[PDB]
Amino acid sequence: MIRDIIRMGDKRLLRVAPQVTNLGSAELHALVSDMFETMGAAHGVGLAAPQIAVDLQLMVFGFPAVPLTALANAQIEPLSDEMENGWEGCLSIPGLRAVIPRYRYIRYRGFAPDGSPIEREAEGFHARVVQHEYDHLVGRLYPSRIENFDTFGFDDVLSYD
Amino acid sequence: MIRDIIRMGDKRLLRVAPQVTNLGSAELHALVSDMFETMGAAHGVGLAAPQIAVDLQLMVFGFPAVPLTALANAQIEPLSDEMENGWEGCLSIPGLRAVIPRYRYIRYRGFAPDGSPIEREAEGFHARVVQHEYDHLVGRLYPSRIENFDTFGFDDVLSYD
Numbered sequence: 001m002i003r004d005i006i007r008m009g010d011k012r013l014l015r016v017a018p019q020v021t022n023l024g025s026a027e028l029h030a031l032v033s034d035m036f037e038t039m040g041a042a043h044g045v046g047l048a049a050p051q052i053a054v055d056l057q058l059m060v061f062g063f064p065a066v067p068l069t070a071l072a073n074a075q076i077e078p079l080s081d082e083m084e085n086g087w088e089g090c091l092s093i094p095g096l097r098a099v100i101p102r103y104r105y106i107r108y109r110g111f112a113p114d115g116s117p118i119e120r121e122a123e124g125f126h127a128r129v130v131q132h133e134y135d136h137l138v139g140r141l142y143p144s145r146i147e148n149f150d151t152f153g154f155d156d157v158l159s160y161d
Numbered sequence: 162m163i164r165d166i167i168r169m170g171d172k173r174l175l176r177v178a179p180q181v182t183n184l185g186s187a188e189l190h191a192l193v194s195d196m197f198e199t200m201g202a203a204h205g206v207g208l209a210a211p212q213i214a215v216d217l218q219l220m221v222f223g224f225p226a227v228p229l230t231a232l233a234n235a236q237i238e239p240l241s242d243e244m245e246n247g248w249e250g251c252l253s254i255p256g257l258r259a260v261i262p263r264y265r266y267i268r269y270r271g272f273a274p275d276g277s278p279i280e281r282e283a284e285g286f287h288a289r290v291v292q293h294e295y296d297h298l299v300g301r302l303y304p305s306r307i308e309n310f311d312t313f314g315f316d317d318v319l320s321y322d
């Protein structure tokens with residue numbers, strides 16, 4: 001079932017989400033099923049549960065190929081201080097994109113919806129997607145991370161390298 | 162003649178505009194005529210010449226009532242340090258609004274399109290409009306002035322006081 005994606009300005013995108021505590025349940029499997037589907041209909045590469053107004057530490061992402069993943073109770077650590085600039089957009093901020101600094105190298109940990117543990121090192125775009133989705137879980141969106149406001153603009157108009 | 166308003170992301174909104182040097186001419190009167198009209202069709206309270214891709218120090222504004230004004234070669238000074246927060250939107254960033262700190266009290270100076278000098282003290286919303294329009298002339302848009310990113314969002318969704 002495709003869910004409505006809420007837009008920036010909605011207070012529910014600004015909350016810090018509680019943990020998932022129904023790993024392995026039929027209710028979580030259906031929520032995650034809904035998320036992949038909603039993400040797919042909107043042409044996303046990541047979708048966080050708060051974006052469909054569900055206050056949970058849960059994100060789906062994937063499709064340089066990133067594996068399709070449902071991740072609960074995500075925890076992220078940088079693996080060094082190297083930052084890298086890259087284009088980001090967000091389904092809750094449609095039409096826009098900016099350049100954002102993210103960590104080149106991360107490890108992320110949590111659980112697959114079935115309860116099995118997930119822990120991975122990620123770099124580049126894989127790592128950027130996870131950091132962007134993780135921000136949602138703590139009530140943060142990308143504009144508050146823009147450093148060069150010349151790069152922020154509408155997708156069909158932008159001519160910055 | 163209604164002109165197209167260019168959208169954030171277009172590099173022409175990022176330029177520092179040269180001075181108007183055709184005060185009193187028929188060409189300037191027609192450009193200003195176009196601006197009031199374009200501003201009116203789009204339901205604006207301010208429109209700066211770079212927003213219709215004209216690289217000039219020129220803005221129209223007006224309609225708490227603000228007088229309808231065409232101002233060339235604007236120069237602004239704060240009349241104290243008091244800042245005040247207030248809602249801003251922009252025709253080149255359609256659908257969005259944020260809260261922005263501006264000076265409560267200003268003086269602005271320049272010329273009416275006919276060449277006669279203009280100098281005014283302004284406060285509150287009058288002053289905010291002029292500071293926002295003036296930013297355009299130096300290649301600055303409002304997102305780079307947001308301090309509370311919780312206030313930035315779509316107009317039909319926002320519930321912040």
Ligand SMILES: NCCc1ccco1
Pocket residue numbers: 044045046047087088089090091128129132133
């Ligand atoms: N759409 C959210 C995922 C994403 C894409 C590019 C950076 O983050």
Ligand SMILES: NCCc1ccco1
Pocket residue numbers: 205206207208248249250251252289290293294
């Ligand atoms: N639309 C540009 C003028 C303006 C309106 C509110 C603050 O600035």
Ligand code: NA
Pocket residue numbers: 014015016138139
């Ligand atoms: Na918050």
Ligand code: NA
Pocket residue numbers: 175176177299300
């Ligand atoms: Na600039």
